[PDB]
Amino acid sequence: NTEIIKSFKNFILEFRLDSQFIYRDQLRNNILVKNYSLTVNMEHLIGYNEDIYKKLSDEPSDIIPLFETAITQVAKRISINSLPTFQLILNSNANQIPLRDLDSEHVSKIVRLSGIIISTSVLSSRATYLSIMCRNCRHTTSITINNFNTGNTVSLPRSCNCGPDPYIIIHESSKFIDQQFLKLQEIPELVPVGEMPRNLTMTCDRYLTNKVIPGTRVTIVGIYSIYNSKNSGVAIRTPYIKILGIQSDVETVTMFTEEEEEEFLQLSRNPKLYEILTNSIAPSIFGNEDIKKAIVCLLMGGSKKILPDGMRLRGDINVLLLGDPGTAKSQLLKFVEKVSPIAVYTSGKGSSAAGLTASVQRDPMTREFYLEGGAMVLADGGVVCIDEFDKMRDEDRVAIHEAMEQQTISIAKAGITTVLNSRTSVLAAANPIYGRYDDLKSPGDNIDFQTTILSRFDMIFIVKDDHNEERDISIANHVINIHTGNANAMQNQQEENGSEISIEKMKRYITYCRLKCAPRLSPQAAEKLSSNFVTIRKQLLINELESTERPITIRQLEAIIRITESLAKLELSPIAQERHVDEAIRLFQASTMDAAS
Template sequence: MSYDQPRVYSTSVFAPTEVSEDSRVQTEELLREFILEFRIDSTFVYRDMLRENILVKQYTLSVDMGHMISYKEELAHRLANEPAEILPLFENAVKSVARGILFPGSDELEDFPECQVTLTSNANPLSIRDINASHISKLVRVPGIVIGASTLSSKATVLHLMCRACHSVKKIAVAGGFAGVQMPRVCEAEAVPGEDKNCPMDPYVIVHEKCTFIDQQVLKLQEAPDMVPVGELPRHIVLSCDRYLTNRVIPGSRCTVMGVYSIYQNKTVSRSTGSGAVAIRNPYVRVVGLQVDSDHNYKGGMRFSDEEEEEFLAMSRLPNLYDMFSSSIAPSIYGNADIKKAVACLLMGGSKKILPDGMRLRGDINVLLLGDPGTAKSQFLKFVEKVSPIAVYTSGKGSSAAGLTASVQRDHTTREFYLEGGAMVLADGGVVCIDEFDKMRDEDRVAIHEAMEQQTISIAKAGITTILNSRTSVLAAANPIFGRYDDMKTPGENIDFQTTILSRFDMIFIVKDDHNESRDRTIARHVMNIQMNKVSAEQTIVGEIPIEKMRRYITYCKQKCAPVLSPEAAEKLSSHFVGIRKQVHQAEQDANERSTIPITVRQLEAVIRIAESLAKLRLSPIATEEHVDEAMRLFFASTMDAVGQGAGSRKELVEEVNKIETELKQRLPIGWSTSYQTLVREFVTGKGYSQNALQKALMVLERRDTIQFRHQRSNVYRSGV
């Protein structure tokens, strides 16, 4: 038959998958030699590791791909490109070596447990969105966040079949992952001489009691938020773990997965979409290695060279590091020095503590920016999202309680419930930036109470009861209840938050847009320079420390340093706290009202965390009295200022406004017309009242008077404005 006939022919363009038995034996022997002979200095790494594991009944061996490359590069290359062929041989080799260690001189492998090989590597990871069809059946290394984990199921590795008619037995091996098995349609047993073999179609039944099973778990891995391009949805992929790789991670864990990129057919989808979907396969990763990132192991394991460590140590000894670091935070924003220093403390964080009774004290610092529109609050949040090693940015109105904490989803195929972590879970070990915090619904805001103090999220939904980690700092921005801060009202009347949420913030800054002519000119000049002279503006805007260097320095400080208070600093801080409590109590008695922002033991812990973060910035293991003094100054400039917010000056302002209001009513008869400048000359220049008080009095007069009176007087204080 020639190929020029009018017919359709097909041929394989891939290399033949069949491997000769001799080649398999040689490969298995090479793998046995690698396990037995590979050593670093005088230590046989894998021989000793395997002996330790099997003595504690753990039949597993973790192999570093770098070691295999240095031992035999060709073998490592085959393992990376043909893992489905090489891994079973590798596990047989491990089983053979383990048998030799336990029972020397015996070659019987029948009754010995199966051994599992797990792989680790330091190769560059591959993003989920970069995996394509060219990676099928090859080893891939993928970083991400686990957003869903199923319960354990049992998967058969060897099926024990028995014919219904002749009771003959057949064993079938089942591949790993989501791979299924095709049951024989006819009985394959040989006929007994002298008897008729009359077995029906589909004769085999599964004898479950004699099958071999392993544990299997299905995970859902999603791209980390910092790896998702702007405007794109995060991609996710399904993982299949078995044996010793199960129950290693929970939703919210950041990990790097090494596995075989495989495909399977979704039977539910193929039935619903018809015969056209027969050739469609869904991808998944059959996990052969799982590296779970620790608390401070940001971005899949950030490593530092010796030169970089020396540079960071030299930087930590700079006398002006604190001012230099804070001025490098959002350098394009004019002023706000204390807010920038507070953000620097938030990025560093304090020290986590586990008490002898098991209680955990958080080390993360929460900051609330509350103030008028146009005071660059959102820009601070955007900058922190950019500079923090792990950060999630969200807006209050677009965030629900489930989106911030965790939601319960149902799998479309298995119909099982599983958890998907929200913003607070995905930002574990980093910062959550919540803009428009005041626009959130109360029931959604209450959902983060536990996460902000206890650093956990408790879930009890749809029969799922669990606790997720949420070790994250919160940087929130909000507006006052009237849109702008009203000096005539108390902080409690301006702040539309419950005491329960306010007490969880370590620092609360009230940012007011004060009218100051010289300051307004400076800000206007600063903004004009940014808008007009782009090249020179960039040179002036860029801080003294570049963003990437700042991010790596933050990570380095968090990895290497966990300061504690010195006895002198602790004594000084405790006496300060007693004085603050007495001062607040006295102020509450004088004003005859309770403070909206309470000063409790939480605030004492907040000052401790701020002092520890200042020590961590300098890589100091001890937080000294100097750090406590600066922490107290920051606390007084933020929370204590918000508690008082000039109670005495507010009282004076109210009295001044009342006097001006009385004089205005006497000064301006109904129907009289005068200009605003005349009133300024008379009341501000002549009588010494403040211009702010005059404006407030005119506004109060307009609000309180009748419509007819206001209409007749309107030209009085509006003319010339």
């Protein structure tokens, strides 16, 4: 109402805490750079009046438009015409009833949720300012459609003998807003008896869209209003969420503040990063020092050279594990999932290997095909994780050969044939032929036939089962510490708070130090690896005279040059050194003699 409005233009130009005067001092600061938006922060709003909140929190749609018009008028005042309407962004943190209140009282009430968005759609257009002409008398009006009860808020009237529906929609003086129809999925840990999860639907506005990629946790605040589409028995309807503010966690397109890198620059000046991360990554893993160094260089990566001709160099690494059960080859892999920016966990069976890359289907509108799914289209930049590279006998091998070593797939199916980009990084952990007897026989028979998959991977660990009767009792001392008593929650808060790094700071950290520094190895260091390699092939061919066959080829040699590029991304030095590169071969030379044994 007008009276209500008189009670908001007189409130969002003098609200302040103690001499900062903030809401004029950001609205001006948001009219210079074109954004046209507010962040009210409703829990901070309550200082005026509980009544004016309660005329909002009990009734909808009317309140949003009245508030928007008041803000537009104040914005107009802070100038002296090209002036668009604004949009609001609200945010609070009460608690998130996950997906349980459905119809009881939470219809058109303010609500806060948490989910994982999986499926985006293409953009669209709805109008917000029109100009309408009649057939009979050339009448001219203008009707604005701001907020919604989707369309059919108000229809085109009959007034201007005169025939009905005399009006049309011209396209010469109009404005448009875009919706999304992105689909929210439940975070799959908090509905536990035995059931599958469900899903909802949500739309939004332009100045808060395209802020999400699928594969992230998000929190979300909004309305629970109801539409009705006539494409089921009783006159029913359907639920959806009009959303207001995605004040989620980080993106997990590199814009952020300066103090986030201030401590990072204050940490990177300390030259103790490489030895301290091996403890600070996995706080519940007994040592395993050689493997732990390989995981931090996998997550960072190398570079990508598009050198001045057609071809390119595949600048990344892909580790591979195998070993006996009970030796941490599997439980380590859930640990790399949370720390990655983008991580996918399809670790089982291969899951119908043609469906790993891309899939088509008949689509219900227009009876057509296009491309929808895939386990590799969403995992660019990050890392996938799979297992069991023995009993996928059908088609796992034919589905990763083109997927690796060029990362340029193209689907030859009934519709398109397009080379969509990929920058993926694979990771796997398998089993040999029941472990023990394989390492007590002729040392082949690990992958039963093919060496051609092994030559695409580069870095291979082989763990074993010793009987060291001394350190094992410390391991038996180690597991009873974590498993009950939970003193490592209090030990790794009394050794971490000055020395170690918590689990969530690295997710902040890795996305910054990758996306800034473009490094290059030292040019005079090229004498080192060339002098290194020539005896390794001699160390190879000293074994084949013993009637021994299989695997070392040159692709691992151009992988070590990516390995020495990896820690240069860690130290963020644009040039490499020789104390740098000798520790890198120190990691690989502990996996050169593995081919001998």
